[PDB]
Design a protein around this nucleic acid. Structure first.
Ligand SMILES: *C[C@@](*)(O)[C@H](CCCNC(N)=[NH2+])NC(=O)[C@@H]1CCCN1C(=O)[C@H](N)Cc1ccccc1
Ligand SMILES: *[C@@H]1O[C@H](CO)[C@@H](O)[C@H](O)[C@H]1NC(C)=O
Ligand SMILES: [K+]
Ligand code: NA
Lengths: 34, 258
DNA sequence: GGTGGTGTGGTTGG
């Protein structure tokens, strides 16, 4: 059984959950255009 | 990790350290995918050619970490393993096809600011993001350079390392290496002419190649650090287990019991 | 120290 965690998976308490971007996540997103 | 940099605090709360009970040594990385399941690479646990065949009792996992060696009191959580499941068609004779394993914890772990699972991909996410030129992120406490030959620099990092690397087109991957590649793998790294660098290295195996979905803001594990030739050489690329293509198995194991 | 040391904060006590 998977167990707990999924509904909230991939959302980082100290970043997404506080509307904070880490220093380089933006470099990823910009790679996804074209 | 070669030419990454220090991770920020809580930047990958799904990073797991796979740790040998005795002698005490960091073996590999891994990822937390739920409160009781950890994903890693099969060759971390089982690689006969190097006489390696770990059982559950040999091993611990350490979650929430940042520092490579210090026990981080009130942050990290150490868990014992109940069961190890290696892909039944993991190909250790030849090219590490299907370099993946699941590890079930004896006791579900509590989440915290430093401990939080990552998502497994679905068909749409895989289809949107798994493309040449798109960048993912790799993390680990593995080597900072090629340690098996004299090189200047420290071997290992004091803290968790991160690098962001572009997925590479399959035919380039193919021609970069004499090792047989399969669709259970993909490769990532900068071309020589791109003049930016970076790579996973020995010790980073099992660690996650993740991508952030611009549609829902969530981090998804697209890959597992599997193999390479050298670290961060011009014209070579790190290879990663293709998580999504192995999803069916992942799910079959994870959902098998209540 | 127990787990380092630009040591009693820090990503956490005393
Ligand atoms: C177990 C992991 O720490 C490590 C990952 C190295 C990733 N390298 C780069 N450049 N990103 N994996 C290995 O060391 C694997 C395990 C067995 C040997 N190996 C290799 O990557 C060899 N260097 C190449 C190879 C040999 C046999 C089968 C497949 C690949
Ligand atoms: C690994 O070791 C176990 C014993 O714990 C053994 O029964 C199993 O066959 C081993 N597999 C290989 C390929 O060595
Ligand atoms: K201290
Ligand atoms: Na390279």
């Amino acid at each position: 059984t998977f167990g707990s965690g999924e509904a909230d998976c991939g959302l980082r308490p100290l970043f997404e959950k506080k509307s904070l971007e880490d220093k380089t996540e933006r470099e990823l997103l910009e790679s996804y255009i074209d | 990790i070669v030419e990454g940099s220090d991770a920020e605090i809580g930047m990958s709360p799904w990073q797991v350290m796979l740790f040998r009970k005795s002698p005490q040594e960091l073996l590999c990385g891994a990822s937390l995918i739920s409160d009781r399941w950890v994903l890693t690479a099969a060759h971390c646990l089982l690689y006969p050619p190097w006489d390696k065949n770990f059982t559950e009792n040999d091993l611990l996992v350490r979650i929430g970490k940042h520092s490579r060696t210090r026990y981080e009191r009130n942050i990290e959580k150490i868990s014992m393993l109940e069961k190890i499941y290696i892909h039944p068609r993991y190909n250790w004779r030849e090219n590490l096809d299907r370099d993946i394993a699941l590890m079930k914890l004896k006791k579900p772990v509590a989440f915290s600011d430093y401990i939080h699972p990552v998502c497994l991909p679905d068909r749409e996410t895989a289809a949107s993001l798994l493309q040449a030129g798109y960048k993912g992120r790799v993390t680990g406490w593995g080597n900072l350079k090629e340690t098996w030959t004299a090189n200047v620099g420290k071997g290992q990092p004091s803290v968790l390392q991160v690098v962001n690397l572009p997925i590479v087109e399959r035919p380039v991957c193919k021609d970069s290496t004499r090792i047989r590649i399969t669709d259970n793998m993909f490769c990532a790294g900068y071309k020589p002419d791109e003049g930016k660098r970076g790579d996973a290295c020995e010790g980073d195996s099992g660690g996650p190649f993740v991508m952030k979905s611009p549609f829902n803001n969530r981090w998804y594990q697209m890959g597992i650090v599997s193999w390479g030739e050298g670290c961060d050489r011009d014209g070579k690329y790190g290879f990663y287990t293709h998580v999504f293509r192995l999803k069916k198995w992942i799910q079959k194991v994870i959902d098998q019991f209540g």
